[PDB]
Ligand binder design. Structure first.
Ligand SMILES: [Zn+2]
Length: 332
């Protein structure tokens, strides 16, 4: 995300706001632009657009607005002290205490990003909008999934590009971010997949719309201009002249992964899937014979596997993604 975070985002934000949302941001980026990755994610999908809208509407039906959903389900905004406390408790719970550097920042386009600074893992947490019941989920996403998968993957024959080719691996995504997103909302009482759904939706529209149009369009789902600005930039990462239609479709991966994993949950071995590293749920049978599983780590929330599966059922119910609908969506 560092490469596609516009170098002039602030100056263009002030311009946008000060024009009362009529101006089209003219973004610039650190040269050179990752042309290959831009081209890979230049087209948006609509495969799950009705699921996205289904989730969004389910939230707004129950909570009226996002604003109330956030405050009612998310809990209080956290101080730095409270964040560190929750993180420390989590690391110990996961048995990875002292392995990851934790940093607090205001300039993240997401809640948190797991990185490799100084050839070492770094968890950057956005202090802006960090909330009690939500933060624990972020840690299940970034540490419980991304980090543990990463460490397990480093131990496997397919730990690098060559290894992936040699063993014939499908891409890690959408299985990676699908698993991570399900894990974020795992133990919540109202586990609505708002973030995933709205990202999916925003990209779909971004492909057709200017920035101005996209920003206005989102008003129907979320009022806060700052929140909307985030979603718009994420959807138009890499776009220079945002007056034209176009998107960076990467963030559609979350909902895409969720649907697929939930659809096939009955045949997926979730411990094994995590143990094999950065692998697709489809590659599990292919790679099982060649995986080294002696000292691979499974997240703490997967130990009671019966309960884990119940949570997945609860997540489907909540998000209006019942078995029958998943069945019709993917007749696999
Ligand atoms: Zn992630």
């Amino acid at each position: 995300l560092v490469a596609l975070r516009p170098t002039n985002m602030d100056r263009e934000r002030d311009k946008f706001f000060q024009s009362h949302y009529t101006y089209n941001p003219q973004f610039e980026y650190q040269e050179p632009m990752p042309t290959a990755v831009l081209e890979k994610y230049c087209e948006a999908s609509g495969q799950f657009i009705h699921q996205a809208v289904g989730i969004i509407e389910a939230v707004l039906e129950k909570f009226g607005t996002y604003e109330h959903f956030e405050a009612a389900t998310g809990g209080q905004l956290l101080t730095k002290c409270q964040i560190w406390s929750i993180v420390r408790k989590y690391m110990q719970k996961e048995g990875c205490a002292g392995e990851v550097v934790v940093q607090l920042s205001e300039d993240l386009l997401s809640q948190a990003v797991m990185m490799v600074e100084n050839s070492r893992p770094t968890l950057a947490i956005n202090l802006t909008g960090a909330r009690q019941y939500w933060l624990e989920g972020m840690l299940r996403h970034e540490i419980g999934t991304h980090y543990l998968r990463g460490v397990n993957n480093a131990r496997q024959p397919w730990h690098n590009a060559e290894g992936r080719l040699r063993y014939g691996l499908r891409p890690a995504n959408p299985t990676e971010e699908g698993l991570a997103s399900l894990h974020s909302v795992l133990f919540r009482k109202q586990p609505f997949l708002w973030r995933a759904a709205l990202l999916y939706y925003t990209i779909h529209r971004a492909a057709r719309m200017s920035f101005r149009q996209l920003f206005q369009d989102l008003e129907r789902y979320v009022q806060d201009a700052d929140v909307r600005w985030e979603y718009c930039v994420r959807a138009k990462r890499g776009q220079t002249d945002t007056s034209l239609p176009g998107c960076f479709s990467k963030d559609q991966v979350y909902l895409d992964g969720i649907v697929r994993i939930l659809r096939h949950r009955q045949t997926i071995d979730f411990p094994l899937l995590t143990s094999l590293g950065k692998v697709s749920y489809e590659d599990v049978d292919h790679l099982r014979p060649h995986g080294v599983l002696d000292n691979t780590r499974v997240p703490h929330f997967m130990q009671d596997l019966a309960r884990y599966r119940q949570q997945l059922e609860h997540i489907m119910a909540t998000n209006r993604l019942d078995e029958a609908e998943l069945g019709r969506l993917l007749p696999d």
